Amino acid sequence: NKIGGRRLIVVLEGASLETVKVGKTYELLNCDKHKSILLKNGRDPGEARPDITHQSLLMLMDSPLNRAGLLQVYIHTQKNVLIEVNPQTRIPRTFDRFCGLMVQLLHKLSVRAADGPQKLLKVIKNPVSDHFPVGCMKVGTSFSIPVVSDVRELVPSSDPIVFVVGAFAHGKVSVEYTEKMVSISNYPLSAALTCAKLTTAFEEVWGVI
């Protein structure tokens, strides 16, 4: 079995996705609309950047890696909500539509296809590490790592592997389950470009062209 159970698992860690009530209407928290409200636990609405997750998901789900069936995505929010993304999910290109979809997800706990019974988005049980397959390395990503890795040299020939990419406005990926941390550039990148780069490198090594 030279294919084995190979696939890339990306966790978007610290994603800024959460709902707030304004008047009678529920909206996705957003630092352009909601700087003047107050949050539980002293959290800062000025850091609410759901656009980072939107743009990262667009790159991940568009990727040839995804449409070849070699990608799985999870989202782990700053409120400790774990979301599984069905590989069939088309993320809306429109930011406002994306936000409405996330409000529905966080309220109902899943979103089903309108043309079938299949859940395309689902809130699942923490920790995300319980959902990884056996024989799987776990790698976190950070600009702060002083040596830069070539991503193609990190791709296993026949194993599944997890990469954790931060989806916060500011911070550093720091989770219990990673076995190492890598930098992939001497420049600080967007999460979305990081995702495009990871998928591109895996596509090359696994022969998705």
Secondary element (H or E) of residue 75: strand 71-77
Does the footprint of its own copies cover residue 95 (CB under 8 A)? yes
DSSP string, 158-172: SSEEEEEEE-SSS--
Q: Which of 20, 58, 173, 198 binds ligand SAH (CB under 6 A)?
A: 173
How many other CB atoms are there within 10 angstroms of residue 141's CB atom?
A: 27
Nearer to ligand SAH, 21 or 128 (CB): 128
Nearer to its own copies, 63 or 78 (CB): 63
DSSP string, 4-19: TT-EEEEEEEEE---E
Nearer to ligand SAH, 110 or 142 (CB): 142
**Pair type for strands 7-15 and 19-22:** unpaired
The gap from C-alpha 142 to its chain's centroid, in whole angstroms, comes to 15
200 annotated as ligand-binding: no
Sign of CA dihedral 67, 70, 74, 75: negative
Secondary element (H or E) of residue 123: strand 119-124
Ranges within 8-67 binding its own copies (CB under 8 A)? 32, 49, 51-52, 55, 58-59, 62-64, 67
For residue 59, the partner it binds in ligand SAH, its own copies, none, with Cβ less than 5 to 8 A by kind, is its own copies
Does the footprint of ligand SAH cover residue 46 (CB under 6 A)? no
Euclidean distance between CA atoms 21 and 31, whole angstroms: 14
Binding mask 143-172 for its own copies (x = CB under 8 A): -----x------------------------
186 annotated as ligand-binding: yes
Binding site for its own copies (CB under 8 A): 32, 49, 51-52, 55, 58-59, 62-64, 67, 93-97, 148, 185-187, 189-190, 192-193, 196-197, 200, 209
Residues that bind ligand SAH (CB under 6 A): 52, 141-143, 165-166, 168-169, 173, 183-185, 187-192, 194
